[PDB]
Symmetry: D2
């Protein structure tokens, strides 16, 4: 998995992710309308006040999102953080206690600004607790973004709860976010500008084509390598104008660091690959995605009809 | 540029390319119908006998293709081959003489099997002659494919004319094709299979995520590195079923090795990037494409209307750079 | 700099380092005998009780070691830790307070087991104090080893004081040690075993020579890359028998990751390179070393003469830079 | 294997090689004096006119050299060229026909200048013929050097006999020399100069230590990678003065690209590693070497005693 965000020139946000998995989770697009029942394990039950859209599954009427985005332009994506993620073994007195899966809707239902999320997370405790008996707790970390800033939320057995500002606009998987940030200093030799002809003791040594400035840029799917590549691409990609160009830019970057089917076989014998790429445009309230076996962009929208529906709106699962 | 071909389980061909350039050329999609006038610099002028589709420009009524594909399922793509490509000073008596730009139509008009193209090429001579004085001769090499085999055609100052079988189904830019083939032996350490946990003198060293067996796979846009990655992806991608799945597999692979805007600045100061990605599906006679600033797939078809049109059918030019 | 330790089949320790710098420091080999005066900034002044040998300079009669090893087979080496290393503003009541330069002698004089060093360090405080106003406080971290275990000591602004067990037997420079350890998981794809011939869609792709399983092993002098390579070599080098074979194995490994003159120019314009490589053999109490411009092994020994000398024994300084 | 040459400021040559093998060949240092019997398979038998030194084996009184150097400052080293090397299946009329193993002494006995070797090789045919019944033909290519130039001699089934000028002063193994030269253009992004701090969308990304300019320099033992690294090191290493400094420089470079024991296991189950590193100094007529298990430099010399001996002078085989 790779998460990505950036803005156009006028602060319109484009924010999304690749889902890179080794099995089928049965997910599909889900629109949660306003005034939908919203239970909490350790807080008063309530109802949604904001409509949200994203990809996920429905568990006894609870929309469990892999990524979701509210009508006000703030979203969150959950990505794998194995060997690090570890939540509290029980709620703590005086904290805002959330089972780790509840963070998706807690963030999208109560906030519109990342700066506010940041202040609220100072009294939040994430609890190691599953939705129900037949689910395990997923070892996730999260990227949260509005149009002004993105933060990384990580709760690990190594370091506890840490919240990072993410100026690169990217997130992958393990190890922890500061490790990845530190790793970038080893890639300062990268340069978009091509090299030119040289004399190696009088032997002409010259580029055969363009691209020689990025010698050393990794192209495999190791999380640290996708991180370096996605970060490099995102910060050097110019700002572009309009919905079509920005959506295209989003998919150009994430299809570049996609995990290609057949190139990764996990230790259990299964292919791991990017099953879908998705982008939320806050300006149009539109969720764009495509699939490993179906490349044309699909669109799903928060609008006056869907934001006010009486039930969840769920699209059949796209068969991988 | 990266060219790519493969087939599905029924022998349906999927064949196309990325165009990675640093300036605008005015190109767009062009259908050339049957019975369209076809001049030759050094051969008897004639008319097209098969319809073709692809990307290119029209120069004084002559469709000059970047890539093109005939209704019988054989296609060709021209890619840059700098510091190598060199053609004859003039025509040669006894040979089939073509200005190098004429090879696109000469191949798509006269053949349906790459086997026949291979035999005819033994008597072909490519000439260093431009279409007119406004254009320079482009230093190209070519990939040609039907459903059964793909070949690379390179005509160089170093080696003369060479024709290679291309079992990898990929082509990029310089150096020459046998150089790239030889390079693959240096990457036999790549493995789709993940590593597992190890004991480094009792220190547990274990992967953090999947992908560890492809350690060393280059991610940059140097032609050698795009060749290795593109070949590695193509040969390990499973054969898939149906038009939608195969077209998506094509774009999945070529977008993986696309040259991303902002990441490559040439020595003249211009961004080099993939301005379009195109796929020809021989089974539906459909040309698919999308662009750096417009990701939706656009489709264009050779069918009973377009193949018997009375003129060139030209779609508008999408601006870039 | 790269520090390295391992043992032979009998538990004889071989422990030393490369010094990779961009200027001359005047260093040379120094034997400090037993019963030599030993002042402390924040502790009762005393005398040495064990003889030590290593590389360093003498400042007003005080041997300031870059690395040093005591007659009981425990040693320590200081390596650069920039952008991390930070020590206390002043001493702290109740702690064993040391100016950071005093750690070399404090360790080699008071311990023979790394286990005891580990316990004492829980009450140690390192102070940001130079030896005098002519020298700046060096931003060091340390590797300490006996025959049984090696530890890394890092005192940083980011993390305070940390002590790590070092099963890899290696240390380089920044970032912090847990960062490097974590990095190793990304290199689980490395394999000493050669690849063999493969079929890439029927194209034979086969190694041209041995070594193909270590595809992706970095060859540059970035501290992260020297750490990965040095750890990989050390853990896969077989245990060897005898003094000559073990000393050679040591130099084989450290010369593999040496920083070669001319290949690294720092932002101030100076060449950074390995000016010397040194190995302490605990079994013979012998310090071996050679230099960038003099490859013969020079040897210096702690024995009954040098350990009971009446003064510091200093060998001449070999000029560099 | 890696071969290396360079000169000091006054044209004194330093020239040698690593031997990287997976088994023991029983080789040792051999001095061949003047007037020693020198048979040829396809030419008149003669005697040596120049003394030579180097590493090799003795086969029925014939010194079969892995590398050797004549008293006049010209040397040759044979290195592996598998899957390419292919010699003539029989002598050709009108050519100077040499069985491929005879080239070592033919070059060192008849020439002092590489420019002369170059002209003579135009009428030379290398023949696929073993020393005797119990030896196979080794698939070698060669590096030949005097103080002014080095050439690469390659006879392959792909390309026939080719002779290259070698301004890099290095040679490894397969593939062919022009392939390696072409490969350097892909590494033009390498720079000895360190990178400096950068702003990745306002995130400080800065080197943690020196060395960042050579991002992408390979450190494994694949022949193409040792070639790139050795070439880079040799052309950026400054010229140095005097015998000690130049011998040290030689070993610094070749120990850097050495094949370290335990890091390479071949498909038959054996470790491959650098068993010896050797350097001939033409100025002192001294052959320096050390070994994987014995690091102190050993020296062997062409002098008035050894150049005029009555038999071969052979040192017992160093046991690996
Ligand atoms: Na509740
Ligand atoms: Na004509
Ligand atoms: Na004191
Ligand atoms: Na004879």
């Amino acid at each position: 998995c790779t998460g990505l965000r950036f803005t156009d020139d006028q602060g319109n946000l484009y924010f999304g992710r690749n889902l890179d998995v080794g099995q089928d989770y049965g997910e599909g697009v889900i629109i949660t309308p306003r005034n939908y029942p919203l239970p909490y394990k350790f807080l008063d039950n309530t109802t949604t006040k904001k409509a949200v859209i994203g990809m996920g599954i429905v568990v006894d009427g609870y929309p469990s999102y892999f990524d979701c985005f509210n009508e006000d332009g703030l979203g969150i994506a959950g990505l794998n953080f194995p060997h690090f993620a570890k939540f509290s073994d029980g709620p703590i007195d005086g904290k805002i206690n959330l089972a780790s899966y509840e963070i998706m809707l807690w963030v999208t239902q109560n906030f519109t600004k990342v700066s506010d999320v940041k202040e609220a997370l100072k009294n939040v405790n994430l609890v190691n607790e599953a939705i129900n008996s037949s689910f395990a707790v997923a070892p996730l970390h999260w990227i949260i973004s509005d149009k002004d800033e993105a933060i990384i939320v990580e709760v690990s057995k190594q370091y506890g709860m840490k919240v990072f500002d993410d100026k690169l606009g990217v997130l992958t998987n393990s190890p922890d976010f500061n490790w990845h940030l530190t790793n970038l200093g080893n890639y300062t030799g990268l340069d978009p500008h091509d090299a030119t002809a040289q004399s190696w003791n009088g032997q002409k040594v010259a580029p055969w084509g363009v691209g020689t400035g990025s010698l050393g840029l990794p192209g495999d799917s190791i999380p640290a390598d996708r991180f370096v590549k996605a970060a490099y691409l995102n910060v050097n990609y110019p700002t572009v104008k309009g919905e079509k160009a920005n959506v295209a830019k989003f998919f150009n970057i994430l299809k570049s660091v996609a995990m290609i089917k057949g190139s990764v076989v996990n230790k259990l014998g299964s292919d791991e690959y990017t099953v879908y790429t998705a982008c939320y445009s806050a300006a149009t309230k539109t969720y764009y995605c495509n699939f490993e076996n179906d490349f044309e962009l699909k669109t799903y929208k928060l609008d006056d009809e869907t934001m006010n529906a009486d039930k969840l709106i769920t699209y059949h699962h796209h068969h991988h």
